[model samples]
Target chain A: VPSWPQILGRLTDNRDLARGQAAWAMDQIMTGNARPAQIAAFAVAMTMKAPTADEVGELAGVMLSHAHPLPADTVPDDAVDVVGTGGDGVNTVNLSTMAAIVVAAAGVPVVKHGNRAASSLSGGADTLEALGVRIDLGPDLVARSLAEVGIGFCFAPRFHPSYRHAAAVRREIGVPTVFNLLGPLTNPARPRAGLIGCAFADLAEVMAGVFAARRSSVLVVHGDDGLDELTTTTTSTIWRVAAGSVDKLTFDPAGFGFARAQLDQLAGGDAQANAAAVRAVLGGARGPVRDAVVLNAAGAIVAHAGLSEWLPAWEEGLRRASAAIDTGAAEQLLARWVRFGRQ
Target chain B: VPSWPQILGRLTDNRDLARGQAAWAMDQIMTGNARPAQIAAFAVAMTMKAPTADEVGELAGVMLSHAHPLPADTVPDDAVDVVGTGGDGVNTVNLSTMAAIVVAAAGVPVVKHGNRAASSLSGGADTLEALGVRIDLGPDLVARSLAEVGIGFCFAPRFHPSYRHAAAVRREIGVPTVFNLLGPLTNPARPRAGLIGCAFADLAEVMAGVFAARRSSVLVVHGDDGLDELTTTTTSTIWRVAAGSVDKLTFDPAGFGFARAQLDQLAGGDAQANAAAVRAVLGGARGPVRDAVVLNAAGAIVAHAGLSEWLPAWEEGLRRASAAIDTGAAEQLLARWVRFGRQ
Candidate 1:
């Protein structure tokens, strides 16, 4: 029980002290005992100092401990997730959510965990609700959805109620801290594999290191044009973590036979508009949105299913995703989730 | 009013932004509306960034505006003060307090402002209390003391109740910030001349620049050995600020025909020990403590009485101070202040 000032003092002076105090501070925040202003100050102070990868991981570990766990029997041992640390300043349609569905349609277990927009106009939950899907399913039902419909959406607030204490402070601060990066790492379902997109390229290597230590298969990415999702508009940096090691790589949509597209083509409007775009892309409409979806979904498949090489897995991922759209399997999966979750 | 986050966002980004926000944040802190943690964070954050002199001045201006003022009719127009920021970590026996009394006995009016220990084992107020002085005198009474007895002690807590809002947070944070420097700058008496000492040499120029802006005759000193007072053990850096300009100089005790003394000889003990030492120094007891007091009193005279040459002023100052101790005038002034202040 180090005092907040002592903790903050350590944080500003030494790296190891910061790593230890970050965990203590997070616990104070999670327990609802810390003041909103104190929490906000902690966030800003830590942001200015920029926590090391180990510190960020310890913070995430504390958050996970306080989160409401999804039953282990409910989710597949091979389940994968696609999510983003959402402060990229680009309001793209929830590409990770669309990619999750596409990857699940390609026969990979998908447990997508997300929240409403912290910075964007349309977050995953907002767009999903507009698309006639129920996102607040119980862990048992979410697991059943994965078994029967191949995809499940775990609304983050329902899984991590402790985050409610930090929500007001984070909103007031209006800037991103390492807590933003923890979202993709602290999934309540504790998925074995994940594809996580971050706002800045510097975070890619740090997050990859976190996943490497956890011995989990994960791909951390950052788009060159300041987006949390992989983009066809510019090069994206990726760090693939598997078997306790990380491999850095660059990804270009052009290299995969897709033409480079302007970021505006992928901009997300309000929930209604973004939901309409989601339907258009999954309905086999040809354009940059669909191309961007295919590229990310391919990476999801390679990460989720443990594919050894990217090119062949990506090509096969495209064929499977296109067939799922043509045969209306992706849309049918959404309909099944809505029916089951609403009951 | 700009929100705390907006203010902090500006502070961490640009110099102009930080300069503007420092005053704004200080006003908020003075109003008692700002959260404790927010105030503490603002303090720590600004400290890490290291405020410019202008920012420190602006913050002091805000504090002075909210302070309880002494009656102008009760004190001389030429009253001066000798004070320190009090985070020097040296724990010396209230050198500035003794110097202030000695300066007054040398035909200069002195209005000294100070507080109970924030970091030291004994502060000016604590020593004054142990010496049987009424330190909680009202501003009017303090002003009267300067007019009638030639000296006054403005206990900080009595003059600046608004600081109570920041006290808890400052204690919790346990770190030095610009607020630490503001104490010596925000005297409720608003003396026309000052001899101030800071813990670090870098702040010498900064405080001098602040005094230059106010167009006041002031001397800012920092000991090379880390004491706030002009040290006999090491060279002291001095910034002579007057006539809208600042001149930097270095002073050595040996240069003035005084023997160099060890800093340990000046170390302050508890309130009782410090009070005993204060009596000894003013009672003509010969020791390093008495020597250190003489050196600082010389600087005070040069600052308060507008003596143009340092060597001559210091030589004459030593003669006047030693004569005051031998003639019992300095001790009599303290007895008169305690009697007048208690009444």
Candidate 2:
């Protein structure tokens, strides 16, 4: 029953109060009691202060509870998710989505949740739609896809209907908020493992802290080049969370058998172009795009397999992912996904 | 055109942006487009950060522009206002309102704008109502009252209808904001001189800076013991703004030939009780209440006369104010005001 002013006043001085208020605000926002301007102002104020791990975690918890759950009866016990908090301002191809497909091809179940383009030229859902994959399936259908095709797409707005209340505010604000950071952590399938790329480096450790309790193994990453996904252009900071602890690590392109790339080479065009690029990467196109996808796909594999040592795990993961593409297994998984979605 | 998020984000970083956005927010708030929670959050956030003088001035400008003006043709060039930012929590009897009547009896035209009790048991308008004075007079009636009786009471909500947009927000927030600092500055009469008592000492200097551009002369005071009006208990910080500059000074009861009194001696009860106290003080009751009223009334006279030297001006002002009350001129003015308001 804390009023908005009471909650916000406490935020001016009390960290614990801010955390609790953040949770309360989420409920009010989702219930449509809070206005768009209110949400926008609150988001901007919180972002300016830079929320703590506990605050972000509380918001994520509220979002998860309100999210439409995938059919729990059909979800795989070892399912993994790959997503990004996409406000990097670097319109790179949908690397995480490509990585999700590669991970599925490597025998790991994938539940990939994403939105249409917001701050980027294209988002995972937009690219997936362009690739002929239906992304608006119901929870049951999505769970069935995960069980049968080894990978399923859950459009963020579809699973997190509560976001509808906040969408206009977020759109009007035109800035990133805790909601941007919460998406990857609140997947409806409740994946045991996740690879989450954040737009800002400071958020990698915070996101890791938020995921440590619920996720068995997760890798939170940010490219030094300001890409949300693991990048070929620069070293990426990574936070590995597992066994109730978080460890920081650095990732370089050369460690995964790839040369440094010019960031422009990985830049995404329109949805049609990005979808074509994804097809080319899965079709064994050799370039920076392929290398970027492989590195992220390797991170997803290490997360799914709960690998502690990154270098050798990444090497083994790279071999599996590259082999999947070379053997056409990745492309065939995309075909099956599209066919199931169209059903 | 700046989005609320954009403005708030900039405020989180740049002081200049905060100043501009504070002005923008006031306009948006007054227009009813800004939501209550948004205003509440913005107000609390800005207050916690402690606004700069320039920021406060910007908001005051917007409020003044939107305020309903008293008839300009009827306003005296040297008319004065006596009011306070009422969050001091001291709950003393309506000292300024009592002082305003005394100042008017001493031949100074008073156009005091005030609201009902907000953070106190009795506000200026509240006590005036209890004393049989009609507070909801229209702009024309208020102008006529000032011309005839040398004083007018402008109930704030009636003159500043735009405040309706922010009233609920401020009430619900229950925290002092720049808006709290604005009431004294936005008098519809645009009085040439003012005696403004702030609840917080930190705001005295800022309020001086804001008033300097508008008033010919003004005194902004804050009692060290937390009273808004000049107190007999302790030295009060005073900012005398005139001639495009502000001079800081300190005033203690001893300097004005009065003994120090406990703040509790001046404590007010409800509107009826406070109204009775005003009568007692004006009826020449000798005690701490009369002393407090004399001290504040002297301040109003000095401000209205544009007196710079503190000791001599206060001494002369005290002589005139005490004579008015002793000869029953102050009581007679109140009766005239009541009769005029009833007519």
Candidate 3:
């Protein structure tokens, strides 16, 4: 294993760490063998220079190595995940969490990975909790939830307990790191598909590369409006990724005959407000909020479902997601998940 | 005071901390309140993007503020220091420490601040201790030594107790930080003159700027041969700093009628070996080791005495240093210091 000095020295010299080296460094960090200063130095160094997809993947793999997993074969091979790295800094309503429910309800089976808010007002866990979906269930029950309700909320803290080791350092340093990218990529289900949203476009590409390298079909997205999820307010950059391919696309709400909406129309309030919005949208509420959720759920649909012409594929996805919400299937999924979690 | 995150965030965004902000950051770091990761991040960040002269001066000033000081009037206004930052990795003999003694024996007072080696096999404190000079003197006794013996050694750890707070972080991080620069510049005596050898030329210019801004007369030297001290092997860049002024000079050993020697002739062994070299040089043994020490002593002598023409001033200083050694004054001073420390 490279020592902290050796690692930091190499970075100051403008060299990147190899996958194996990054793995050793991260394992030491997660095992509590490394000092806080060591953690901060590596985080800041890598943050300044930015890690490549392989390094990011290796570090996240080390994180997942210690995570609580779903019982063997509990999750189907075609399971999907939808989440964002959540640093957009806009107090917007929870789009991806609701979209996650819609995707699962529409028969895609989302193993949704989520945590509390990073910079946003409401996160996947908080908004899900507000809508009365249990987020604290263990892996076995989560898989059971997936089998019965076609959706499972894999609460991040429950699976990545090793995260506690480096939690204080990340907070102390107070800047985003590879750990932020790892958050959306490290699902306990190891699903074959993901709709990952990032605040920065380059990071979206990196996330897509990591997912594609894992042989997962994925859509990694960022909005020019600074939203992690796709925005009806403006154009969002999307990376369509597969086992051996990555295609970049410009997804404008207007380009696809979708209704153009104002950012204010998508803003969210506190947890209760966000939770109520989740319920309202699932209950067939219309306008920008539902439109935004539908757009993102459509993204996951096309991402996992695959597409030929991007716009029509997205339009088809929109119809399917709208049906999931209009028929009350999405609303009923959350109700079942809440009861399953409590039981 | 800016918090660690705010400071770190500013750096990540390509902005440097102001003087007040740096002081707060450093003060927190030296107080043990900042976590290891926080210290490591700051150190690595500053290292990656070098600190400016004003910022470096500000940080060194903060370090000096917490250092134990000699009693008022214990140190003469003309007292000087001769030391190196010691990262050359050449394993050279203790030139600066003995040169400090030589400069003092020649009637110029010297106040030396020293610590154990960073990478060198022997540092000023180690060699001084090997020579039987007590390095554990408190402020009063150290002040007494300067008053009575014309030379005093300020052992770093004893003077900067607050340094304990950052010591662990520095060790674990394994990379050099602003602390390394602060080590050579932080003389508890607060002398007006210094001959400081840096391993890097750019850092020499920075050190000179820091001292000149403080109204000091100092010579910051970096040998192109990878020696921190003025090397007889090749050219060394020397920054001559006086009140509001800095002049860069290319100092070739042969340019001043000094001997040209190989680094092997100047290489040092353990503390005992270094201590013997010091004794041999001061006893008028003529060779590379003595030549190197005398040249550095000449640097201190000219640095404190001020000069008309650079070459002639250096030659005069060389003569003065030679007389100090030839008359047995430097050797006797060491003997007296050993006795004084023991008593």
Candidate 4:
């Protein structure tokens, strides 16, 4: 029942929206009842104010409630997703998608949720499609991919058909809002765990707060070099919430036996170019791209099992992730995913 | 030359725009090159940021460059206009309009500028229209009314056809923006002096600063009671800029021998009701409406004269406004204005 102006009035007043108010506003916007100007005003006003945890949670919570659920039997209880808040403008390699493949190869299933890029060179769906996987598959096909290949890609638009209204407004407004954070949290598979990379430190903290309020295990990371994923070039801050506890720590890839590399070596290009980087990483290539992917893959693997004691689980996950790459299981899994996706 | 995206990027980064950029951005918006979402984003982002005086003045300067200029010989060099930044939502009586009538009657020619009500029950145009005056007069008709009756109305939309683009955006966005601040400053008749009321104290300070950057005389006032005009209920703040000097002071009508009136007594209604209140005050009826009208009338009269020393000028203007009502000059002026406006 809330109009966009009332929402704007409340939000621009320099405070966060109430949970109910945020839900109502997103409902109005997604239903197309909110005019373009209203939606733009809502987006810019909330963006400039920097959406708070309560607002982000309530807004995304609404998106998930409308999502089409994947078959419960298709994925295990600890199935996980790897995702990112990718407005970093850094255009780093497709670390999260590669990490998802590596994580799944390490024995945990990954139901990665993503869409085509807006301001970036490559999205998860874009990279995956370029790697010979069908990203626009039906729910049954996606379930089959998860069951047979240990990983799946859920094209966001296909699963979030109701988002068309907000989608047009977002494109016209041409700015990132709390809506960008929802893609990672609203996975149709309802993965029990997730690894989310954010571009900002405070946003990572806020994202962790949302996960902290949930029973699911999730890790939020922000690289100091401005990459959304954990950086091989510098240290990254990490927040993990699982088993009713929230842990905050700093991570340096070098401390975990990964060699430091310059950011230029990890830069991304088009979908085809990024797909090659993902393939090189999974094929056991040793470089910043592989280091970044394996680093993030460890996060996904550890989160899937829960982070009740983060360090031991994190170390174990790193060992498992490295072994998956060394044994060529990641390469084998990617090949199987592409075949099943095409079939 | 600048696109809306670049402007948005600069502004939402938590800093003010440079003067040239502000001019260019407003030009883009006013020329309709900026899309609805872009304009709305610009409006809400800047509104939430609270436009600085440099930005406000620069934006209004661009509007004036496209504005219809009033003929110089048609009005006196010291002609004054009374205006308000009126999104008060308090719905007070037509204080500024009534004040303009008194100031014009008290020997200062006035070319008051306004549009029909957007949110209020009666804008100056609306109240003047209800009082049997034609508010849609052309420039020549407006000039003739000014020469023959000492006061005239320039319908804003007539002088500002260029604002149609921004107007539509503002209407859809449905909130007060920096554009609302531009109306008083963008008066096409280009009056030499103005009495501008703002609903906010800090905004009054900013308005005064805009005038301080010019050679023209202007007074900005905000009531402690949250009325846009000086309140009879309590003390009000006054910021006067004249002869390159900015003087800030508190003004109490009671200190000048005017008694206090409750805000309820100053509450307004539709055009017809506000029209009667203006008629009764000029007809020499004494009450809160009369006190409120006369108090603001003095500010307009003094602002018409350069305020090198505000207190003496303020005291003298109050005396002139009181005598104009006592001697029936205001009543005579109203009768002639209605006839001239219709003719």
Best by TM-score: 4
Model 2 lDDT tens row, B1-343: 7666665545544344544677888899888887654665566556655677788888877887888887658888888889999888777889999999999999988889889988778788889999999999999998889888889878778888887878876775454666789888888888879789998777778889888866459999989898788989989888988897899988777976799999899998999999999999988899999999999999999897783366778888999999999999999999998998777
How does residue B137 of candidate 4 score in lDDT? 82
Q: Residue pairs in steric clash, candidate 2?
A: none
**What DockQ number belongs to candidate 3?**
0.75
- Which pairs of residues collide in candidate 4? none
Per-residue lDDT for A89-204 in model 4, tens only?
87778888889888999998888899888888888888888889889977888898888888888888888877887788778766666666777777888787988888866677
In model 2, the Cα lDDT at residue A247 comes to 91
Task: Highest DockQ: give the candidate number.
Answer: 3
Error of 1 at B58 (Å): 2.3
Model 2 lDDT per residue over A1-343, tens place? 7676565545554344544777888888888887654665566556555677788888888888898987647777778889988888877899999999999998989988888888788899999999999889889899889888999988888888877878776665454666678778788888878889898676678889888866469889889888888888989888988986899988787865689899899988989999999999998899999988888898889897783365778788889988888999999999999988777
Please give, for residues A20-120, the per-residue lDDT of candidate 1 as tens digits: 67788888898988876567657756765656777778878988898877776878788889998888888788899888877787778899999888868
Task: Give the alpha-carbon lDDT of every model.
Answer: 0.80, 0.82, 0.84, 0.82
Q: TM-score for every candidate vs. truth?
A: 0.89, 0.89, 0.95, 0.96
Candidate 1 lDDT over residue span B1-343, tens digit each: 6777676665544334444577888898999878765775577666655677788889889989999998757767777889998788877899999988888888888888998998889988899999988899888778777778988888888999988877667665565666778888989888878889998666668788888888888889888898888998989888888788898888888887678788788888899999999999888898888888888887877776662366777788788877777789998988887788567
Better candidate number, 1 or 3, judged by DockQ: 3
Question: Per-residue error at A335 for model 2, in Å?
Answer: 1.6
Q: What is candidate 3's lDDT per residue for B78-185, written digit by digit as tens?
A: 989998887787888988998999999999999899898877788888888888899999999998898888889898889999978677788878777766788777
* lDDT by residue for model 4 (B92-177), tens: 78989889988888988899988887888888888988999888887888898888898989888998888898999888977677
